[PDB]
């Protein structure tokens, strides 16, 4: 059926990627809201900590999350560190 507001509550699902709750506070660039989430699957993969949102639930962000690989240059800022 449908997909919309059936009357099915209560009710859990598991999905491949996991999804953390990181420490650095980010800024969605949809959402432009305080949220610090990171997937643990893509963090390993990619080797690098990725930014999301909580509203990645169901927001059109959950996509870019899927299409991560489409990237391209966007800030021209050179990049720097922190105690390393
Ligand atoms: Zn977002
Ligand atoms: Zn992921």
């Not at 660039?29 to 997937?39: D, L, P």
């Amino acid at each position: 059926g449908p997909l919309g507001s059936p009357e099915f509550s209560y009710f859990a699902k598991i999905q491949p990627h996991t999804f953390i709750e990181g420490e650095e506070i980010v800024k969605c660039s949809e959402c432009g809201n305080e949220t610090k989430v990171f997937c643990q699957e893509c963090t390993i993969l990619k080797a690098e900590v990725v930014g999301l949102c909580h509203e990645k639930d169901t927001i059109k962000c959950q996509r870019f999350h899927e299409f991560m690989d489409f990237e391209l240059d966007k800030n021209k800022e050179v990049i720097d560190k922190r105690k390393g």
